[PDB]
Symmetry: D2
């Protein structure tokens, strides 16, 4: 950082982290023969780049802190319209189409707070063309301290796979003994620092940042 011309070398250029990368095709192939099942998807930075709404929320309710995340007024705006500014991730499209082909039941489990009304389910169904037969209303698990709110829902809906970008998404899957697969969080996300994908030895989907 304090070096004007750091230069580089071939050992560093070729250096690789010991991560288990997988592709959508590889995941689909690993599911050959398996009958329809319940699968879950994280929302923020997994299927939607929702930073635009979280950014406006921060500037609007807590310019110098994260208190906006605990403000009921922020969640009202976020879950009822701000996802109109959320950009769908290509990696998610491919996964959702793949699961739709298998006839799998799709669930969305988010750490967002639950509000009286929400249009998130609709935005997800419309943007990813999810048939009514595979779609399920979004589950707002919320976020409590010293506890992982995702676990209860993964267990009750008997989800066999869970896609997520955060550590708590992956550890939740591990707690339930199911297959947790990591999605890369975009570099321009406002939710930092970026998590260390593969920090639990889990499978990480290549090029899933967009």
């Amino acid at each position: 950082p304090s070096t004007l011309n750091p230069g580089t070398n071939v050992a560093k250029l070729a250096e690789q982290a010991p991560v288990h990368w997988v592709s959508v095709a590889q995941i689909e192939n690993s599911l050959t023969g398996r009958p329809p099942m319940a699968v879950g998807f994280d929302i923020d930075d997994t299927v939607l780049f929702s930073s635009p709404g979280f950014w406006r929320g921060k500037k609007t309710y807590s310019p110098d802190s994260d208190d906006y995340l605990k403000n009921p007024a922020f969640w009202e705006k976020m879950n009822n319209g701000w996802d109109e500014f959320s950009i769908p991730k290509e990696a998610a499209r491919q996964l959702i189409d793949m699961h739709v082909r298998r006839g799998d039941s799709i669930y969305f489990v988010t750490g967002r707070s639950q509000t009286k009304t929400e249009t998130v389910s609709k935005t997800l169904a419309d943007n990813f063309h999810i048939p009514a037969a595979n779609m399920n209303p979004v589950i707002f698990a919320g976020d409590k301290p010293e506890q992982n709110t995702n676990v209860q829902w993964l267990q009750e809906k008997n989800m066999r796979i869970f896609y997520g970008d955060s550590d708590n998404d992956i550890t939740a899957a591990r707690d339930c003994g199911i297959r947790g697969i990591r999605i890369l969080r975009a570099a321009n996300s406002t939710y930092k620092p970026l998590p260390q994908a593969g920090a639990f030895g889990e499978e990480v989907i290549v090029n899933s940042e967009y």
Copy 2:
């Protein structure tokens, strides 16, 4: 078969012949030079504005790019939708560096002009630009009452121009000034992504965010 394409060390270390530069190297290259005029493209250069453009398309032209011609879209985009635009860190670093030098900052955009705009305000607030170095956003185009980006670069005598698109760089070369490329983010809705360095120009590292 092609389920596992694998890879090899030659592919892992392969590099494209690009002239990469850092903000600190740019600064160092300007040491001793007096304050000057510098310009910045806006979209995908200093602001990740795809959210607004994405909503604009889904709202006015779901199956095409016609929304880019709809005056109703531009009224919304230049008057508030940038509150949903994410400022780029690379830009922040560049702007702070130019402010320290006392340079005069200009913003040139190909966005359509509207009677009113709050983009200038959003830019000055998000990047904490002093009024001394701030200048109202300039909207360029092919229209009769408006000058092209080239004409604006010459008129203000900009010595450096930052941008993510090929037209941003060629304009700079056509004026004989220094054109520096900014990387466009992979999740931008404006695709395909351009080839940074395709003109042998300098490209700022890790400038995608």
Copy 3:
């Protein structure tokens, strides 16, 4: 191709779907397991022996690979030219780890068998392998006086096999054991480079040197 091809952030971040592992991860996966038999291919796995093959080609077959079938080449290659072979650091780490475990180490090669060989001594000296864990190099082949690689893997009951070639990995698969891939250096003369991970196998990171 083109003079100034440039690049984009999607391409810069693109990753192949490969299962990378580190030596530390391999050791951890062996925790608690009693001493066992493991095997290593030789060329481009534990030794960068291209210098000997390069000189062989230049001396006996400048225009082809006919030297690989010349008895005169193998006499020199297995009795001294490996003094010019450079040990790989990835291999040292793997061998040191298996030595700490007390495992028996076997070296399997597809090199033509000669009446005498100094390769075994070269390997033992270079990787400081204790007498109890060292075993004479095994020359595998088609000849009626020798067994294939698969046969040796089974006969010695090797649980793991390290190699840089596709046939090294398929050999491990056929025997139902754990085949682990080592990257072949880009300056090796044995080309083209194989596609590490083409069989979904584990590939050791930074194992090109």
Copy 4:
């Protein structure tokens, strides 16, 4: 540390280095009359570590003292390069300069010996025509020799290719163009230098 993981900012992170290709170098010389250019030898045009490795194992297993043993240089300069592997990056550069009609010079820091077959090895491996070939130049700090810098000025070289920092500073001191070649990761000459540490041009994929 067992599972360090990674993130996309780290995967796309680039060092601020000025990379160039042989084609871009050729293009920048468009229209220039034939000139003199120079190449370092070890890890620049030849992967000579095999011989240095054997030398080390034979005279200084635990150190680099072999680099000052006369017995080592006699063998290194008269035959061990038969095990030295030509670099493809250098092959392209040399062909490119030969096509332009430029004069090729090879400057090395290896200790000078009575006889040497290195010149022969280079001319044959890279098929350099007599009209462009010149005997290897052994530069040094001894009173009977000239420094690399003096040789660059003497022969009026306009470009110097090398993998080491001193190769680049030598060119800088002469006011000529110094271009960096990447040293192979399996070279025995460690640690690897930081290519670009002088803001100089660095040739892509030049490790092999």
